[model samples]
Target chain A: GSGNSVTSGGYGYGTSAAAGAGVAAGSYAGAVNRLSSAEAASRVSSNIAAIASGGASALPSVISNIYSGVVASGVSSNEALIQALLELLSALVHVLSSASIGNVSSVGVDSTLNVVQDSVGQYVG
Target chain B: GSGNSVTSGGYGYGTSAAAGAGVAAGSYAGAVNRLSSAEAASRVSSNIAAIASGGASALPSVISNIYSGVVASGVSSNEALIQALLELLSALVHVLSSASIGNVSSVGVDSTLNVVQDSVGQYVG
Candidate 1:
């Protein structure tokens, strides 16, 4: 069914989302030109990994949080949104990794991505 | 059925997405803190409007392009990703707005949003 197509698409969306988060992470890593790209990438990789690990349940909340247009967790809206976005993407990468490495069924993969995608869809048009 | 819920959710998602993009647009408007919040908000409003106007077809391509992790249109990958993210969100806002203001059916709204969400799902997981 459509799940197969969605599951396949999820991999690239996960990658692209990660890259988008990486860009934001990389920029802030050297906001004052304090870190090299390598260091920034490494730092962001770890940061992304951290977010990925804790993201499963936090994702839906993140999307709704972004909608609030206010400070989140005491951070400015931009940073808050970026952090949420990063966390979402990072977690997605990890989820995709699990699917590919563990030979998970495409149904599970689509179901998982569906949770994320639906969360966004549930919140925004 | 579920379409009504998703469609309702889309309205909030559109607002929140607009706000998320606004946060980024505002930050860049005054990288050195040069612009007032009012001015930045206004500028971002227009920027989002512009993106929303032309973003429909570009949405899927943007997600795929982010997977490349390279400069796009001569811009750094980060900017490119943000632009894509913002454009995706911004366009979604307009679509939802249309759904609400123009008496569009819930089915059309979901279909339009499904296109965007499914686009991401197809590539990222």
Candidate 2:
């Protein structure tokens, strides 16, 4: 469904492993400024669409994953962890939609899911 | 069941701690552009199904976490955060897959996991 190429010296994707001194959520007011003028509405709409399309089942686990991941990392607080992930995910969905990436792959999604779940397991276990 | 070495020369999963000038959630066409041709289609498909399967519970939390994280971080807008995280996740997925690593350790996942959730909590709280 997607056809992106991993060209050398191109904009590369990084890891899903979050680390560092977390800032509180909704703190990075500068990030949204980067969105293209035309893409803002589309991005928000698509994000809503992505969420709507995904529906209720996935939301809690995703939230739990975020909570567990942050907690497991021994982060200072849950508030910072949640804010960072939320900001990061919002950026991700916008990019995907803007670029018309269609949808992220299963293995890729699993990779993310594993990261979240694994983090949770480590913290709670 | 898969374990890829994080050799000094190896590609490591980056932090899910989203920051910086975020683009749209999925605007990183540049990222997918970097993917090997063979892996491109598979990546898209896998991501889609994962979202579909993660269902109602995980998806919204995931989205809210991202939003809350961004807002909490004081991100300018949700567009950039969404894009950045998505690109980062894509990169992470590709790196892990190409390296042939399976789900990361529960601990490792948890480590990054904390970053995402703590962010959300702070923003929403």
Candidate 3:
């Protein structure tokens, strides 16, 4: 599941929500210099794992700041892609924060992360 | 439901996910100059309505840029609040996009917007 191989489940989970809304399906290809579905998903997964591992109290600020920088950079023209990425971050924060307090199950966190990874993979992979 | 009065259902829908994770419950008070729960929720509701009202194709870029400006302003310390706001926005994009394509239900879109409104109201109101 962590590898580059595209899994069947949860791929494009975020975008699926968008697709359900009837937006044209597309990718943010070449919008950001270093942005990729794999990278974005990886970043999200790492963030979630970090929070789950006890970085929860402080990581939200760090994540928010980083997101601010990304938006400020003007690197992406595909707003939907950027929105998807941001949603992934939001979901990660939610999962990590919950995991920190033991309110959310690890399986739930992992499940969400898998969705994020798959969502991004659809566009960048 | 559209009025400023806080409703009981779906308020803090975005942050509820965060609270489930154990992040300290707090508001983004005094962060952005004009930021408030009511305002943010209103913004989200407006965006959703716009997309649902045939503005979906063009608004994602518009919304993304606006969010960038908010982040660049350096206003909020409540990272959780910021994240919740972002999540609501993301949810709107998803719902609107789906509506544009006729793949989503009007009822579902309305439900999500209600949640966005309630989510922000919890913090700013």
Candidate 4:
């Protein structure tokens, strides 16, 4: 999985299949969509991968999607920034149900994603 | 320099002596301060190190200080978020003068700091 590779430094973030998975899909060449959580867990198990996989760069659209009505769509990305936001959002998603918290191992997407990978694991699984 | 080790690992954000250097110092156990850039770069050269050193956990306060008059002072931190914010502010600091832009090799403070370390290098030097 890209989880290891991202932090490992192959620019693994560009590898995840999330780009082809949903509505935000193919918005561009290497596009990712605005994004989700688990059953609570189940809710995200299906979507967290996409959000987690999107990395820092996907924040704007995802955030836009989350706050779709209150905000306008557009612009984004960043690793730790990505994780921090996503994890925080995960906390919110889980809030209606139960959960909160989230890590750092790299600078870019993978590191954030590894946190996200094992990440979505903690949340979704 | 702690720069290499940060991204290299070891959470370099804990180093750099920014705490001993200023105002937001010792606000807590492993305290960090509210923070700056040189000339603007120079402005930050003196202060960025502190914010850079503070890492993720220091954001809220630092940001609070900057927008002090407009915003309240309190709460925060995060690596990429730290860097992203710092760098963006750097852009602003540099804005009056002339500069902009900033990476990642890891997560945690160091990685972000490494980016910040070599970072301050790029900005200040």
Candidate 5:
């Protein structure tokens, strides 16, 4: 529960706790050195949020690296490009949104995150 | 006639050859392999003209691929991920410019080619 959050109206425990629960249930974050899928997902979100705040300027450049790797990773068709874009956009949205929503600069982060979520969802997904 | 630029006063034939009089041969420097259509389109415009001009030392690694891929490929629908944001931006621009500039760049290659030629007149044409 240390890592989880509250749900809508702050009622339920969040994904991180569920992830930890998963760990308690002997998920790899517990057994192996690696995090569970839920935990990995959570970390991904955290990483993205960290990258987004003061990270805006660095984004286009980061995305460029991602795109190249995705390309060279050998997806091979137009569909692959679309898939990579969606995957990256999804990771960014999930991460930014999951971060605790109560800080000063986070207000900007929230706004930017929401806008990206809305726009990317419509265009990418 | 050769590579498309002839001023009102440059007076005939330089790079390729003259019609009949003073016949001259041609030359080839380094071995240039056939680039993908995407690569060709990119060269015509300085390759992400925005990013390539000046960005970072590892910059090209950062911004060149996606934007270039998008335009030459002509992917119109919303894609989940883009090859690069630059490609994403250019594709969006080409698409929007088509809708904006009298529904021009939205059609066949010839039409798109003309529109590309015209608008890129300022740059990549």
Candidate 6:
């Protein structure tokens, strides 16, 4: 069974009938409601620092939480920033969750930081 | 096994060893390489129009493609734009994939469009 399209104002944030079939319908929503773009960014930054400071094992959980939270609600005045952050998060998750975890290095962190910086620039400047 | 942190430069785009356990690695990479942010945005816009112009069913596939593409590579000079687009896509996917498809209305599309417009604005402005 198919559903209707969302055409209202704002981002149409809500739960759907198909939700039950998946892990959890609004898991991301609850998490999202509690986060802001800056806060999310700050968390990611700290995660980056942790990884940079020789805490490689911390990457998965850090990336996963940020990814989930952002996927749920992490919006900002500038939606672009949130979007950039999500994309970077996606990249991080993909890399960190790979079979060859050792291959991931500062390059991943730097790239994520670059996206974060660029995303922030969109609003700050 | 834990991997190292990514800390070189650019966005640390790569595959980690942990990939084998999941669905598939680099699926997004291939799809991403084939798409550009503008192209992806245009596709999303058309999907929006399709949904708006009495083709709500078109949303799932349309949103899914763009999501996969963006997840893979769909990077642009403006990473923020890409990120925003991805977040909107994530929202769309979550909504469209819901069990209660009927609840999704123009509200979802409008919210997605709003994000696209804002994301584009970041670059265009």
lDDT of 1 at A116: 36
Report the C-alpha lDDT of model 6 over B26-119, residue by residue, as the tens digit: 1112222222334444444444333222222333444445545544653432332333344333222221211122211211222232332222
For model 5 chain B, give the 10-residue run with minimal summed lDDT. B24-33
Q: Which ten residues in a row have the lowest lDDT in candidate 4 chain A?
A: A22-31
Candidate 5's displacement at residue B69, Å, is 26
Worst 10 residues of 1 chain A by lDDT: A4-13
Q: How far does residue B121 in candidate 1 sit from its true spot (Å)?
A: 22
Task: Go through the candidates in order and give each one's C-alpha lDDT.
Answer: 0.31, 0.31, 0.32, 0.25, 0.26, 0.30
**Candidate 2 chain A weakest lDDT stretch, 10 residues:** A6-15
Query: Candidate 1 lDDT, tens digit per residue, B11-69?
Result: 22223333332223212211112112232222333333332333334445545543342
- How well does model 2 score by local distance difference test? 0.31
Candidate 3's TM-score: 0.25
Identify the runs in model 4 with alpha carbons over 4 angstroms from their true place: A1-125, B1-46, B69-88, B91-125
Write model 2 residue lDDT over A1-125, tens digit each, in one string: 22432221101222123232322222332222222223233233333333333322233344454444435545344233333345334432332222222343344443344343232222111
TM-scores of all candidate predictions against the true structure: 0.28, 0.23, 0.25, 0.20, 0.25, 0.23
Error of 1 at B119 (Å): 21
Deviating ranges (above 4 Å) for candidate 5: A1-50, A102-125, B1-125
User: Mind giving the per-residue lDDT tens digits that candidate 5 earns over A1-125?
Assistant: 33432211111222122222121101111111111223233323333433344233334444444445545745332222232343333333332222222212111222232222222222221
Q: Candidate 3's residue-wise lDDT over A21-117, tens digit each?
A: 2121222212222332343443444444333333223234435544554556564322333433443333332331222121112122212222222
Q: iRMSD per model? A: 22.6, 19.1, 21.8, 19.9, 27.8, 22.5
Best by TM-score: 1
Model 6 chain B — which ten-residue stretch has the worst lDDT? B19-28
Model 3 per-residue lDDT tens digits across residues B25-113: 22121222132234444344444433333222323443454455455646432333343344233333333122312121112222222
Model 4, span B1-125: residue lDDT tens: 22221111112222222332211111111111122211122223333333333433333444444333212223322222232233233312211111111221112222222222222221111
Off by over 4 Å in 3: A1-32, A37-84, A87-125, B1-36, B51-60, B64-74, B77-125
Residue B67 in model 5: lDDT: 34
